[PDB]
Structure formats: C-alpha cells, structure tokens
Amino acid sequence: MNINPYFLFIDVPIQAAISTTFPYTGVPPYSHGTGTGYTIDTVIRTHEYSNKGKQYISDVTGCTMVDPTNGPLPEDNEPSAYAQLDCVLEALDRMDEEHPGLFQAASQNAMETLMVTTVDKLTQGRQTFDWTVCRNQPAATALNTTITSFRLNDLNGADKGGLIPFCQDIIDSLDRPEMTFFSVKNIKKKLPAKNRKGFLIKRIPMKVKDKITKVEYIKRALSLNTMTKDAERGKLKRRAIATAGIQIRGFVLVVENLAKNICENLEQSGLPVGGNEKKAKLSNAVAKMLSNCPPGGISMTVTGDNTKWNECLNPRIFLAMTERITRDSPIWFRDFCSIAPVLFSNKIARLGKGFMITSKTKRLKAQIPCPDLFSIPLERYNEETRAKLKKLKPFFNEEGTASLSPGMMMGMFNMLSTVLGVAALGIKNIGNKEYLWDGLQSSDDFALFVNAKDEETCMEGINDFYRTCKLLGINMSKKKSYCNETGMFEFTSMFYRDGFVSNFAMELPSFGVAGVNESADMAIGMTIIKNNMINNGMGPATAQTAIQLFIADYRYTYKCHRGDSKVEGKRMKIIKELWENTKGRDGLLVADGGPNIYNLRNLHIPEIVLKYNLMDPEYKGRLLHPQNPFVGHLSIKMDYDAVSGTHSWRTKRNRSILNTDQRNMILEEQCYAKCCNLFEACFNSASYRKPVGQHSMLEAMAHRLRMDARLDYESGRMSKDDFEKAMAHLGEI
Amino acid sequence: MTLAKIELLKQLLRDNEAKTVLKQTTVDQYNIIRKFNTSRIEKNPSLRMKWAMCSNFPLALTKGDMANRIPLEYKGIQLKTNAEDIGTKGQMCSIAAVTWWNTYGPIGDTEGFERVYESFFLRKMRLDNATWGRITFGPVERVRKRVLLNPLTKEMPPDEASNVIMEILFPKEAGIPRESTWIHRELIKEKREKLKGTMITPIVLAYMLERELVARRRFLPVAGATSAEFIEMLHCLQGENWRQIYHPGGNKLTESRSQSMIVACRKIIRRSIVASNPLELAVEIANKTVIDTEPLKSCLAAIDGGDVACDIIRAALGLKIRQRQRFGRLELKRISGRGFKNDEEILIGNGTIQKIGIWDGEEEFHVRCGECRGILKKSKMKLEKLLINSAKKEDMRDLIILCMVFSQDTRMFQGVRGEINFLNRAGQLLSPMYQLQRYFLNRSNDLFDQWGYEESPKASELHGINESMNASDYTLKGVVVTRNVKVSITKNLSLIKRTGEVIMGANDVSELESQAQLMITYDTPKMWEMGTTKELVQNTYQWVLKNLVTLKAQFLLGKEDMFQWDAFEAFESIIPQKMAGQYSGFARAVLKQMRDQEVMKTDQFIKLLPFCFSPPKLRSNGEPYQFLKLVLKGGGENFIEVRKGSPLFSYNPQTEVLTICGRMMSLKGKIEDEERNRSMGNAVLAGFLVSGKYDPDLGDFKTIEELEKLKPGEKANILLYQGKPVKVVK
Amino acid sequence: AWMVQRSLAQEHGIETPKYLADLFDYKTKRFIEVGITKGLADDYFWKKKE
Amino acid sequence: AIERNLARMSPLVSVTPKKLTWEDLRPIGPHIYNHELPEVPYNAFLLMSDELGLANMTEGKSKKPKTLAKECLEKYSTLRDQTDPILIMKSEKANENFLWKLWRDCVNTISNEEMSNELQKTNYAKWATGDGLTYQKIMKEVAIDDETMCQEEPKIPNKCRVAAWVQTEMNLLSTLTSKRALDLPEIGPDVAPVEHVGSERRKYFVNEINYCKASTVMMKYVLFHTSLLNESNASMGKYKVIPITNRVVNEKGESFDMLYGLAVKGQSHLRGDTDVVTVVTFEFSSTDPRVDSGKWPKYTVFRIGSLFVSGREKSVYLYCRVNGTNKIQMKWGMEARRCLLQSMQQMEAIVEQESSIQGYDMTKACFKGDRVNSPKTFSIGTQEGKLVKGSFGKALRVIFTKCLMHYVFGNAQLEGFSAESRRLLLLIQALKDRKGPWVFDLEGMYSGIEECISNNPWVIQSAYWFNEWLGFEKEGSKVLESVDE
RNA sequence: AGUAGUAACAAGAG
RNA sequence: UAUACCUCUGCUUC
User: Fold this and answer.
1) Which of A71, A307, B240, D209 satisfies CB 3.0 to 4.6 Å to A53 for a cystine?
2) Cβ distance A184 to A208 under 8 Å?
3) Is D412 on the interface with A (CB under 8 A)?
C-alpha cells in the first residue's frame, strides 16, 4: 500500500490545508561567494528592457545613459520599460479627481514633518554605503564620517541640527571642485616601558586629509552597492540586492513619507497596512465586488504578480509623479522632492567582489576585482560570464562600475511605486465597455477583481488592464499570474477561500529561540505562541506543545536544564548547586535550571513577575541586583515585555576587527563613548530623550556642573573646600 | 558627585581627542556619536546565539566593582577571562558566570521593584483573581478591529506622556513647561512618591512608565469582548470554532458596562422582534443575560445611561427609563417633547448640499457638558431657549456650541467656511452632524458671528454673556446664564404612557451591530439565537441536517407543518423584514414543487427550508417573487444563491459534500438514486420545469423581470451557474 | 537657561516661571525680567504684568 | 492619452488568455519516468528507516556520551570487537582501508578509559576529513598573468529518475512502533477548561506521532546536530568522535539508550555561516545494500556481525560515508522538533472544525469514533491502482513525516518546486470547485516548476505523487462534467 | 573526497 | 629570511 500525502487534498481542499505545502521546517537557500554575476544579470536585463529607447552620454558623469520613457511602444510581451508620461499623468489626474485634497495634504504633512526632521534621523538606516571608505558601514558611522568629511569642506549644515541644511550641504557638495576627507594611517611611537629595553612601540593612528576630484566624488555619491540576497524562500536561483549611500537617504525619506501619507488614505493600497488589517481591507474589498452585479454578473478574481518590477520602473516617471503630486506645494519643497528621482535617474551600480579564477592542477584560486575584470582574455572566463561581460561593456566604467540610468533597486520606492500601481487600479474601465475592475496593490504583488456580464468580457477587461499597465511600465507575469471565478484567491502568501484561511507554516520559523538573550527570548518565545494562537489559528493542544518545544530548544541552546536533572555541563554544575541551595525551587527561572511554569493562560506574563513571590530573598536579590554587571547601559520589528535582570545580558563584540586596519574605530568609538557616558552623567535624561542644541557639547556640561556645584554648595551638600575646588576646576575649563 | 564629574571632566579634557570631540560635537550630534560603533547588524541571531553559546566566553561584562566580585574560575569552571571586550572594555565571561552570580553573588536591594513593575503585576492579579466559566464548541464570527492590547494608567499621546515621564524622572531637564503638568499633577505626585526610594535605573522607570502611559492599539480578530483586560487574554477567550467564558479580576469601568449594555439590549430586541409576543422573549432572555459578572437587571438599574433599547428593556423588566442622549461630549436628558427625524438636503454655509436628518417637533432637555449644566428648549432647526449655569469657560463655550449644533439651527448650518468632510486619523468618514461638531468645536468664530445678539435679561438672578464667555449687556440670541442651578410596554415593545401616547419606538433602535466591550453571556439554552448572521446560518443548517431524517419524511405527509419550527425564528431575525415574506413565499413554492411533483433535491430542500418560516408574500398574480440570490443582514458576502453556490452555502455532488460557512458536511447515504442527471432548473424558479436544453431560437438567458412576466406554458432559456445553459418552461 | 531656571526654582522650592526670565536674585530668591523700552516705562510695565 | 495610446498599440501585446481544462494539465516532469537516467540516490545526512539502534537499558538519566557509547558497545561486544572487515559494497571514490581504520579508531577511542573523545590526526582521518584540500589564495597580479587559470564552469545538479526507496521511506517512516523517542518538557498546571481540553487533546495528538517512526529519526537528527554544533565550535581544530545517540522509552516504561552509529567530526574553523565542516558517518543497519544498490552509491557498506532482532538472526551491516554540514543546517537541525507543530496544527484545525459542527470535543470521535459518530477516514494512498482509507492518526503521521522530509531534503529545489507547484495546485482546486479558471502562459508555469526537478528525492517523488493524484482527480472530474447537463 | 549547486568552503591572517 | 610546533580570528564587510 503506497502512501501518497497529496491524497489528503482529495478530502481537505488546498486552501484548507495550505500549511502542508510550505516546507518552512526546512533550510532556506543561502548565497555562496560573489554576486557579481547576479548584479551583471540585472544590469544587462534592465537595459535589455529599454535598449530601444534613447541612448546618450551624460556630460556630468561621462556614463552611458538609456531613456525608455516616451519611447516606442512594445510589439511583444517581453518586459517593457517604455512608459508613457501622459498616461501616467492621466492615471494620476484620475486619482486626484477621485481623491482630491490628499495630494496637497500629504505634501503639507510631509513638508511639516521634514521641517521638524533632524539629522540624527539618518542613523536608523541600518547598512549604508560609506563613500569615504567605499564600504558598507553602520548608518551612524557612515553619517558621522560624512559629517566630519563635510566639515573639512566648510559645510556645517549638520551643526544646525535640521535635515534641510544637511541636504543643502549634500546638493552643494556636488559643486565642490575637490572633496576632501579623512583617512587614518598609523604611526610608531616609543612609549616608556619596563622591558629590558626601556620602551615599547605602539602604532598610534592618525588622521590624514585625502582629496577626490568633483567627478570621482559625484560618481561615488551616485553609486549603489550590491550583494546577493540570502535566505530568500520559495525560489530556486538567487538574485542581487543593493545598498544606497548617505546622500540620497534624506531625499528618499521625504518621498516615501509623502507616498506613505498618500497610500494611507487609498482604499486599494495594501501599504503600510499590517498583515492583520490587510484581511480587513481585502475581505471587505471582495464583499463589495461580490454584491455589485447580481444578474449573471461574473465576478472574477485575478491572482496577480509582476515581472521585472524593479527593472522596468523608471526614475524619470517617479520624478513626474513627485512633480504632479507636489503641485500645490511651494517651490523649495518641489525642488527638494525632485532630487532623489534625479539621483536614481543618474545612478551608478557597483559590481560586488568580482569573479574567482582557479587552477585545479596547481590547486590555486584568486578573486579578480571589478576594475581588473577585463584585464584578462574573455576566453578564460566561463561560457555564461563570457556572454555577460561582452554585454556589460557598453555600460561599463573604467573604475569598475556599471552605469544604470533606468530601473530601480530591490526595495527603494515601495510606497511611490505602490501608488503607481493603485493609479493603474484607478481607471477601472476603458471605452465604456461592459465591465469594471478594482483591486489591491502591494509593490510587485497585486490582486485584481473584474466584474462583468460574461467572462469573455472579463478577460478583455483583464487584457485592457494588462495593456494599460504596459503604458505605466508595469509588467504583469503571464507565467505566474492566474485568474479564476471570485470566491478564492492568493495575495502575498495570504489565501482567501470564502474567507482568509490560516497559514501557520509561514510563522513557524519564528517559534525558535530568537537570539537576543535568556531574558528576552523567553518572553518572545511565549508571546509568539500567544499571538499565533490568536491570528494564525493554533489550537490549545498545539500551542501547549509549542510551549514545550520552545523550552526544549531554550534549555539546549542556553544549556540550562532542570536543576534536578543530571545533564552535565559547566553551567549545569552550578545550576545543580543552586537547585540544592535554593528553597523556593519553583521560584527559579528556567535559565537557572528552574521549572517551566508557563501555560496557555499566562503567556502574556513575564516569568520573573510570575515567579517573584516564589523566589528566595537572596535569589531575587542576586537575580535583580540593581547594579549587576551583566546588563549594560540601556537606551529606549517587535517589542516584548521583560524585566531587567542578570539574564538580560549582552554578548561580546565580534573580534575579527582586531587584526585588520580598522582597529582605529575602536579608539574612535571609545573616545566618543567616554564623552557620551559622561554627558549622560551630566544629563541623565539624555538616555531617554534626545538632547537638543546647536551649542557646544562641553558648554552644556560646564554650565550644568557649575549650577550643580553652586546649588550643592548653597543647599548645604558640598563644603567650601569642594565648592572652591569645583569652581577652581571649572574656572580653568 | 559633582566634584567627581568635574574631576573626570578635567581628566577627560586632557585627552586632546576628547577635548576636540567635546568642543566640536554639538548637543544634537550627541545623538549620532552615541550610536557610533564597530558593531554590525546581526542578520541571523537565531543562529549566531546557538553558535555563540558553544563558545568559551561569549558574554561581555561591565567594568566595575561588581564585575570584580566575580572570580576568574570556580571549582574548575572558568567563569571569566582577563581579556577585555571591545565594546564594554570590561572582562569577558561565560554564561556560567550568570549562574554563579545568581547563586553566590551579592544580595542587592529590591525595594520598590513591585511598584516599579506594578504594571506587570496588575496582570498577575488580574489573572490570579479571575474566574473562568464554560467552554462551548461552535462557530464564531471574528471581526478584525483595532483594539487596546493592555490596560493603561492614563492614556496620553506620546509627546504628552514623555513630558510627564520627564517631569517625574528628570524634573530639572524638562525644559519648557506644558499644560500637561497641571492636568496630571496628581499622577506626577503619585508616581514621584511611589518611585522615590528605588535603586533601579531611570531609563527602566521611563520604559515602564511609557508602557503604562502610551497606548498599544493593534488590529486583532475579536468576538464579543474588546476591553483591554479581555484583549490581553484574547488567546484564551475564543477560537474560530470554540468559545471560553472568562471573568477577569480587579475593578471594571462603568463606561465599559454602558458600552456592552446597549449592544446586549439591541441584540435581545433584534431577536425577540420576529417571534410573536416579543415582550415574552425579551423578558425571558434579558432575565438571564449577563454582562461579565453583573446581570443586565443590575446594570440597567445601577447605570444611568442607556439609549433606546435599554429603556425598552428597562420598561420590560420594570424600572425607570432614563431617556438620555450623548452628542459627542454633550450629555442630554429628556424633560419633554418627542421629536421625529426626517432626512432632508441642506445647502450648508460654505456652499454644498448635505443629506442630514432634521428633527421635527418641539423638545426640551436637561443638559450637561463636563462641568457646565443647563436646560435646552429647541424646535425644528431653532434654538428657542438655552438656560445654562456659570462654569469653566471651555465648558460653557462647548456647551453652547454643542447645543447650537445639536439644535440643527439654520444660523449654525449657514455658518460654515472651507470644508467639513475631513476623515479621522485612521481614514474614516465621520457622520454629517459629528463632522459639524468636530468642526465648530475648533472654528467657532463663524458660528458666534453668524449667530446674532440681543438684550440681556434684567431679572436679578439672570445674566447674559458674550463670545469670550464673559458677562455682557448684549447676550447671544437665545442664550441665558442664570444664577440658580407611569409608563407601560406593548407586546411589540413600544412604550405607552397613561395618556395613550407612545414614547419609545421598537423601530427606533439602531440597526448598527457593534462589538461589545465586556463578556456578553446568555445564561439560557440556545445562546446562538443572539448570534451573528453566519453563526445563526450555520447553526440553523446544522439543526436542519441533524433532523433531515424526519424533516424530509414529514414533507411527504404534513403539508405546512414543518415550515414553522422553533429553530427558524432565529434564522429569520437575520433576514431583511422587507424580503422575508417574499423569500418565504418563493422557497415554500419551490419546495412544494419538489413535494407535489416527482423532482426532489435534498441539497436544495436543506438550503430553502429555513427561509420558509416567515409568513409568505406572493405577488398580485398569486405567483411568488423569483430570485437569483437571497441576501442577509450585514456583509456583502452574506447571501444564498439559488442556482449557484455561495460564500455561505455550497454543494459538491462529486463527493456529496455540503459546505456551510466553510465547514464540511457529508450527505452521502442521504440522497435519492435519480438525482444523478436531475437538472437544477426544476427547483430554481417556482412553477417552472426543464423541457429540453438551450435552444438558440429562444434567444438569450431571460432575466427574472422577464421570467416573472412570461405567460404560463412558455419556453425560455436560463443559466444555472456559469457554463450550464438550460431550457425551462412555466 | 531652562535647566538653570528649573534647577534654581526646584532647589529653592518655588514655582517655575512659565516664561524664560532674564536674571535671578540669590538673596531674594526671586526671578527678574529686564525690559528696555523707548518711550514711557509705565506703558511697558503693566503690559508685562499681564 | 491612455485610450489614444491603447488604440495605436500593437494587437500582439496581449495576455493571450485560455480557459483551463483538465486535459491541459499534462503530468509534470516527464523525464523522471525515463529509465535512461540514473535513479535518484539516498543523499540525507543520517539513515532514517534503515537505522539500527543498539539499545542499552539505563536509569533514564543523562550520562556522558562516550560513557554511553562505551557501555552500549560493552553490551554488544560481538560487533565492537569485530576487527575483520567484510566489505559488501563500496562508494566509487572511497577508501576501504582508511574508512575501516577510521571506524576502528572511533570504536577503540570511545571504548578506552580516558576522558577525551579526540581522534589522532592520522592520514586516513586526514583523507576522510579532507585535510588541506582548500586551494591557496594568491594575488590578482599573479592570477592575471597565469594563463592556465580560468573561471570554473559551475556544477549543475544531475537529472535523476524516480526511485522506490523514497516511496518505501514514506511508507515506513509514517508507521507506528512501540518506542517513544520525544523529550517533551513539563508545562504549568491546568486551570482554564481550554487548557484541560488541550491537555486531553495532546494525549491523542502527541502520542500518535511519538509512537511512530519518524519521531525517533527526527529526535536523532536533533540531538545529533545539537552536539555536533557544540563540538564544531568548542573543539575547532580537533578531530573528535561523536556518537549518534537517542534515548527511547518502550510501552512498559523502560529507558533504553539507543546508539545508531558513530560519527567523525572534521576540522571546524567555521567563519561564514555557509562554511562547511566535513563529517564522516558510520551507521549500523540491517539492510542488505545489494537489494537496492541504486540507493547507496554514496555509501560504503561493511558486514560486522549479526543480532537476534525479532527472535531470528539478522545480519548487522555498517554503513560508512563521508558527509558534510554547516552552522546553518546544524541550527536548523536543532530546530526540527517544530515538524510536530506544522502537522499537529493542521489536524487540530480539523478537530476544531468538526467540534464546531457537533458542539463538543470531537477528538476521540475523529480518532477512535464514538457512540454517535464514526472515526475520521482520509484517502491515505494507493494500492494496486485503487484508493485506500487511512485513519486520522495515519493522516497526521503522514503530514508529520512529510514535514520531516521537508527538512531532511530541504533545499532550493524543494523551495522552487513547492512554491511554483503550489500555483498549479490552486488551479486544480479551482477546477475541482468549478470556478472556471483561466491561464495566460501555462508553459511558463510548467517551465518554472520543472527546472526544480533534478536530483532531490522528495521533489522527484512529490512530482510522481502529484501526477498520480492529478491522475486520480481526472477520474473524479468525470462525475461533475455531466451534472445537470 | 565530500558538502554543495550557476559559487563557494574543505581554515584565514601577522 | 627569522621570530612562528608562536600569536590573533569564527557575521566585521575593502
């Protein structure tokens, strides 16, 4: 008797048992080595979709530019990037006509937001391309380097605090003939020592001023870094993703804020709608389309998906979109909003590491940097790369980068593109034919409803929608998209079948131990179960099972099995002692080899708070010792409820930096850290609330400490000695 | 400590780097240089942790005495190492070091801990003190709504909350004084007193404060209970296919009762309306309804709120009826006069037409807003008199404005400028009057200017006031500031007074069916009856399938005996009363077709049998109303197709599987032999039979308007479901 | 300035001025507001008193 | 502008829609049936169905792994003492001598009296581990001049055909045993009725999986990877021997420690997450590889004795193989218990949906049947070309097994195949429901799916199963096609 | 060898 | 050339 797990689908329908078609217990595919091939693929294809447009050499950068917009319409189903401005403007006019006031209101909100937005805002951009060192760095560091660099070119917009002067300095820095910036280099110095030879050589780092010419700077300012996307689910082959510089961030923020402020008020945009609310939108949007045409009215649903979404959409359109949307706004704001598209219209793409060539005979390998990419016979590359490199040539730059005028990068203008999709959804009809379409949009993923009298019309409506989208540079995936009679459909891995079904598989990877620490991961671990019980349809048995499995994973990961158990380990050896010593054993946390007291009803309660009354005074005292060394200097995506105890620790820093030339940044860091740690002692609220001021960081401390001294004296805390000493010290400062 | 700070400052300033950093860096830029580090963003912490936990010294300590109290090793086990951490510049250590510290470390001060983390403990007492009830299996309609996740101390906007936190924790650094301080001075005082002696770091106190001040509102699937202290237990309260009665401990709000009470009463009424002798049901149910812990009796008795349904029930059990209304912030009680709403179109001041329900008839209310009290006398679009007391300026003002708007005066309607069709922050369109309220509450100058003035009362006890809420000789037209501060119920739930006049209309309650706040319980058999559309639909069809054995048999014996059955009364309470009869008359006929003639369809019989309860309504001709789909109350989804399947009801003849609101049922072993090639046309229209198949010469698929107008004995084409043409005759 | 003002007011134990004062007298424990008018002083005075 | 453009745009630009009919659904992966290709070989990390665990009764509490394997081998000395290699089958590029030397080194190293589980870095160990096999990095300046150096053509997965060992693995892993392997920890006491219902449900749901085969295999993978990861980081440069351990409880309630084999940990200076550590597996078995040779081309099989298994004597074989893993897969191994939740939730959904219909806990009803209702029955599989009805528990265990196999064979091929085939599934559902589904470029769907079928056993089997099912549905369609009309 | 799969590891660095 | 059967590193990007 041959078992067939598919035969379940004879009994239970596919949506009802959709969880079993997701292999999320398995491993997701990671990348290996270089992504240059994947980047080059994108560069070639992006131009492949627009090569019948207008080619021209940029007199600024000296790069090869291609312009599809207002180009010849396609005569085939190959991904077209040839959008038509007029049609976009009409699609916009329709949206404005049906949503009047939104266009200017959103702009005013975004403007009034911008005006308040400070520079520090840029620090929360995660990985950012640092143009000074030409590497992906933390946003804060990439920003700091850019500010310190700007300071050398007499650009102190940052000192004012606001974003506007900084952005001004950014667009101004383009005019600079030679951009100067710091670069660190080492120096030997004989420090005194008790070392036979009475001295020691420590390489003290020192900063050096380095110059870049206007063009070479502009090229970096316009550059985008690239890397293969790891762990991307539900796909065979890998692909590339990009990272932006510090310059464009401020200009994108505003545009996305605007597009957000717009999208929020649209009813056919699924962004920034929470996954839970997306159903509230979708099911209703369906309910509307259902009861609209009773008499033989065939309501069809189309499970949409777009191809080459990023590689077809052109900045030149987004510029027009900003220009239209900002109609009523003043000029400076239009000029402000217009910049990011202008940059993306003239952007440059970096090609990652390169390609590794080898000899099996000699067992040798070597990476060929993108500059040296062509310093070799093309026959020595493999068959595909040989084809790619030939096609890359016309868009290739001397310094080893690829010019890329058309197309967008993976995840840049999500909002503003979603708007362009909704704009397609806004037409609803063409030529007064007997049908009406509506739908929901989300970047490259869309769901299209079409109501009409007979399906022959519906299909022509869908065809009209397709042919329409072509004019916006939006390309529907004939291969991945499919249509059916309304009642069931799929949208961003959410499955509707006369009501959205659960897809428990999707969230299953989150059940594991998160990797923050013992304290947090518990809270997270229970909270995930608690939430998945509510939203994703997990019964009490399965939930209670997950409660067990998580503790199982938790105790192995953090090596903290039951104190009564006999599992051996360095920690366990002490845990057992703690078990023997402690009286209120049920008061012990699992991290301390305590018993799991959680169940369905108290998932939402922190373990410490649960067990507090069961703890011994010394144990809770030690566990919650106010000045314990394990918890660091805290400072106020999902958040959790947890208590700050000894299990709330932080791990060691990655030490690989120690034996590289970036050692400096440790001293550069700690140099700040000292000043900030002190400034926090002077101003305790600094940790909570962002301090404000364009004045000197020292001045504040001086004044504050002076007042502290004076008041501590006159109140009767400090003695005349301490006051005179304090004032004597401060006097010098 | 100051001396130490200054000394450390001087020691730091020696370092030219630190000096230049302190001199060059700005107070703004502090926010940047703080986040400067060599650290990188961990893209796979789930892995990196599992890896790191297998290393020797994964953790980093803080440099200090408490670190030095930890020994290097302990009974062979290496606790920590000499090597410093790059970030902390303190020693590194193994996780064991934690387990040591917890076992043999220094015992620290934990006084205040409970008050600091009070917010969390309140959950623990809200669970520990709670009491659980019954668990019931059966369908549950979950409505996805934004709700408050946790109960707060006092809800504020983030900006307002942070300032309070700042006032509590860092009073010297609060900066510019806000009004908030004066409003929450008692809260500040309290938290200041409660969090004084503790040793815990302020940054934690601010977090816990912000947790219990700032609100966490999120979209969730909810059914019944929506109060925070219910939401926090939501995972246990319900599923899709089960319900759990839960009674949380601690005190509960009055408004939370007032919220649910209304829904409960409305829901009782909506059911009891359809069944003859409504009062009987209403009383039967209301007697045994429960709001969380309080009976509906105790609630209606104790609370002085209600609206319409509440009074009707109040008069059904026997107690006073507070005819009170709420216009946003304005609270009204009825002194005399019963007005009637009439939908008209008004051309409002700014120059736009608006469909508004104008209230005809004279009316007199006892009025209160915040602290300001008064008496209101109004007529159809006119403030006749407004006799108020003196109070705070904003209350007097808002009282007068809310009265001006509530009165629907033309002087108000013709005092609009710009636009008044703005949505709320979520993006929802407010109602015509509440928009005018939200508008004139802000921009009142137009109203006050457009209103008009007149002579003040010269009676000693009376006074008049002007636009700025100050005494004046020229008062606002119709405004006065004075110094001085049985019933029975019908079978059909209308309240009559001794003089024969009726004051409450059974058909005067709101059809709007909102989610309650607390646990709405019905301590009776057949709870479902007071349920949602789909719940009732499902339970009904289930009850049909459960008794199909007898119900299908009696249909060959008892003529109209089945059509009326206890269970169907509920179902009918779903159906629009304007269609119930038309549906019943059709269903009964289509069924009678399958009875009297030799063409049965069990799947259809089951589908239609519930619709036949309500007394039928045929056309003038004697023929019933033909239908494509039978619509139900609420949600465009909720309808039963006649030819095709539908979101609520569909049938799969391949597996003989009946789908009801998603749930699967098996009809196998309960189907006749000849239902194989038995077309559906013989149970789609009443008094119609399939002759042949689609004959092009007959033309197109004829619609209901045509089919009803066709003469008896006349062929026509009909489309069952997509791709199934049929040739039918009358 | 606000830190100074609030520190002084809080340390001395008095209400914080809602506006930003100019000086503070240590002996009197009183904040001081300085005004530089052109015409009459009496005019500029009672306007501040409001 | 829009319409004026649409007017002048070429007709060739269209969506080319077509209404889907069942005959358009041609069986996916036409090559998997071609015998001209090699049948897909077993490529997992450890053995699953063919596993043979040496059982050692204990107190039921943790001991040191070396001591455990030592005592186990002490119990079963006859196999441990066997120094005489009886080679049955040999992996093409393996080395009998090195492998057997490695096996003996493992056995003896573990069997010895000292604490350390370290192996001497011998030549056979260096071969089996793959010492110094990494290429030497050099300057680009050199490599550019060196004309012999070239970019390597990438290795593309081979095109395998269907193999029955997968089918059998599925048939067996889903079957019941008398041995429970799970290590489920304690939870808080029940108070609310929901918790009692859940707890009462777990007795039915959990045990149904725990008693089955796949559970033990899973726990083996988990517990193994758990330690392998620890050694990989704790002892990077040291070759170490790690036992394939799993504690088990029989129906009587006696804790038997199971030793399925011994594994050699390679050199693990793992920097990047994807960086590989080579692990050499020596696993006991009772399977004669000559029977299904196509299954074991990656393995080297010895014959090291015999045991009284089910009363009768059975020949004990030693399956020797050079394997490899990394931080990612070890972590995902450690997080494999979840294979429960995905299969347990999916069915508890059905128990809840049923309980909704009849208004009480329908668990016992679904599993065993009851006074009112019959037990739940599902179409579980085929038998000489006809359906077969399996119980709820079997339907559960089948899903659990599937979810396990998702991990054990999880890779890009599985991701792509699942993702792309899910669409065709949904279309087939639309057809089953008669919702008149249309397609725009079906060859695209197919081309998208079929490129993911190369040399993944579960993919290649799932394709076959999919075609069989798709076959059986088309017989069902014939019932609907002529309804009414 | 092997892991693995459109490119990598099978240690790297001073 | 050497120190170097030494030293540093395991997400730290060139």
Assistant:
1) A71
2) yes
3) yes
- Look at residues B433, B409, B407, B403 and name the one whose alpha carbon lies nearest to residue B421: B433
- Give the span between the Cα atoms of D284 and A36, in whole angstroms: 45
Measured CA to CA in angstroms, residue D479 lies from A11, A34, A451, B195 at distances of 16, 55, 30, 75
What is the helix (H) or strand (E) element at residue B244, kind and residue range? Answer: strand B242-247
The approach used to solve this structure was X-ray
- Ligand-binding annotation for A307, yes or no, is yes
* Whether B580 contacts B614, CB under 8 Å: yes
Contacts of C26 in chain A (CB under 8 A): 714
Domain locations along chain A? 30-265+307-412, 266-306+413-500, 501-651, 652-733
Tokens read off for B4: 């130490």
Indicate the domain borders of chain D: 16-39+156-211+335-485, 40-133+212-334
**B429 DSSP β-pair partners:** B423
Q: Tell me the DSSP string of A272-283.
A: S--HHHHHHHHH
Tell whether D355 lies on the interface with B, counting CB pairs under 8 A: yes
| Interatomic separation, CA of residue D135 and C1' of nucleotide E10, rounded (Å) | 9
Nearest by CB to A11, from D205, D345, D378: name it. Answer: D378
| Inter-chain touch B177–C16, beta carbons under 8 Å | yes
Strand F at less than 7 A from CB of D234:
no
Amino acid D237 CA to nucleotide F5 C1' distance, rounded Å: 15
**Under DSSP, is residue A441 helix (H, G, I), strand (E, B) or coil?**
strand
CB A282 within 8 A of CB A290: no
In a mutagenesis test of the B interface, which of C11, C16, C19 is the best target, namely the one with the most B β-carbons within 10 Å?
C16
A498 with A488: CB under 8 angstroms?
yes
Please list the residues that pair with D195 across neighbouring strands: none
Q: How far apart are CA B588 and CA B596, in angstroms?
A: 12
| Rounded Cα gap, residues A560 and D304, in angstroms | 39
Task: Check the CA dihedral B488-B493-B495-B496 and report its sign.
Answer: negative
For tokens 């349809």, name the residue.
Answer: A537
Contact between residue A91 and residue D5 where contact means Cβ atoms under 8 Å apart? no
Whole-angstrom CA distances from D169 to B447, D42, D163, D398 are: 82, 10, 11, 11
**Residue in the block written with tokens 């992996």:** D91
* Residue B666: C-alpha distances to residues B543, B654, D351, D375 (Å): 14, 11, 16, 13
Resolution reached, in Å? 3.4
CA distance B176 to chain C (A): 7
Q: Look up the protein residue whose alpha carbon has the minimum distance to the C1' of E6.
A: D154
To the nearest 10°, the Cα dihedral for A110, A114, A115, A119? 170
Distances (CA, A) of A428 to A462, A466, A470, A667, C5: 10, 12, 15, 61, 63
Å from the D276 CA to the E3 C1': 6
CA B208, CA B195: separation in Å to the nearest integer?
Answer: 11
Strand partners, B640: B630
**For residues D20 and D26, what is the distance between their CA atoms, to the nearest angstrom?**
12
Sign of CA dihedral A548, A549, A552, A553: negative
